[PDB]
Ligand binder design. Structure first.
Ligand SMILES: CC(=O)N[C@H]1CN[C@H](CO)[C@@H](O)[C@@H]1O
Length: 333
């Protein structure tokens, strides 16, 4: 039988009775949290614990990269944007401290993974990449990123590189338009695809971009068996998990109904479909996974973080080194 899984979201600070009923379905493999869910660190710990009271095995995720994408804000250290870490004499050291601190904190409120870091290159072109990108030079970005990942891992967290093959060049937004990248496969392999390649080893999961690369595949990357099977698994040698990008955005609407979107997405090789912000679409997706009788991909458990979810991380020395280290660069407060 086919494999696959599904990442939901809720709309409140605590679980409504529908949220609990739907969490009980095994086809569901994770939940993602946004600003609207997050009130205080304690509140997030309670929410994680209430979710795990129902499904201890569910992956809990957040978009916490620092900079202008940081959901966990009050009670947490404000982590810089990756561009800010880019320009420092010791940016590799500051990147390791960033990833480890970010991940120790995100895990310290009972989450498993963040989707970090962004391996997209800043060409000063895409609206959505902006300061999130580590650099514009592929090898510099990738060295930096790789160190960020070393930190996450040191803290116990599985690292998730987004967005394959690269959102840097497409000058449209994936949430509203359908972004297109007309570059050749060799020009992508030479620029934007470099960090995925270099980090394919050290990455545990990847998220495809909803950009279309018509010189490679007519369909968007997350729907593309050429992008996901031939170039990624067979070529880049990637063995981790493939989280689809959010299937409620416009970059995903090329296929059709949300059930159809998750069919394309898992049939292309994604291990986990992300449906956010629409409960209706998430329930139609879920119906489709029920019908297909999916089983969770075996590798998903590899995303669950190994760090203790307590307040005891403050008394580790690596916490003081990271704090001092980061304060000196003027990244942290
Ligand atoms: C292209 C982009 O920025 N995608 C984001 C959309 N929202 C997802 C769920 O929050 C994120 O994981 C992606 O980074």
């Amino acid at each position: 039988h086919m494999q696959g899984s599904l990442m939901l979201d809720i709309g409140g600070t605590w679980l409504t009775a529908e949220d609990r009923q739907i969490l009980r379905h095994p086809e569901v493999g994770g939940l993602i949290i946004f600003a609207r869910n997050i009130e205080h660190p304690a509140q997030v710990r309670e929410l994680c614990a209430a979710i795990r009271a129902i499904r201890p095995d569910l992956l809990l995720a957040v978009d916490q990269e620092g900079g202008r994408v940081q959901r966990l804000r009050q009670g947490f250290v404000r982590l810089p944007a990756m561009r800010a870490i880019a320009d420092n004499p010791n940016a590799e050291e500051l990147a390791e401290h960033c990833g480890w601190l970010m991940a120790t904190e995100v895990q310290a409120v009972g989450l498993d993974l963040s989707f970090a870091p962004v391996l997209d290159l800043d060409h000063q072109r895409s609206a959505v990449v902006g300061s999130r990108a580590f650099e514009g030079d592929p090898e510099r970005a990738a060295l930096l990123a790789g160190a960020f990942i070393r930190g996450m891992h040191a803290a116990g967290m599985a690292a998730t590189g987004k967005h394959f093959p690269g959102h840097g060049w497409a000058e449209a937004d994936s949430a509203v338009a359908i972004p297109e990248d007309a570059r050749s496969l060799e020009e992508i392999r030479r620029s934007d695809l470099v960090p995925f390649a270099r980090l394919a080893g050290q990455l545990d999961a990847l998220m495809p971009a909803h950009v279309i690369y018509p010189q490679v595949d007519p369909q968007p990357a997350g729907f593309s068996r050429r992008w996901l099977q031939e170039i990624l698994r067979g070529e880049l040698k990637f063995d981790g998990v493939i989280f689809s990008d959010d299937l409620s955005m416009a970059g995903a609407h090329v296929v059709g109904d949300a059930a159809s979107r998750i069919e394309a997405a898992l049939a292309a090789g994604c291990d986990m479909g992300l449906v956010c912000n629409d409960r209706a679409s998430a329930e139609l997706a879920l119906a489709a996974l029920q019908r297909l009788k999916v089983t969770p991909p075996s590798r998903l458990q590899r995303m669950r973080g190994k760090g203790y979810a307590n307040t005891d991380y403050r008394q580790q020395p690596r916490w003081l080194e990271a704090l001092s280290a980061l304060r000196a660069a003027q990244l942290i407060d």
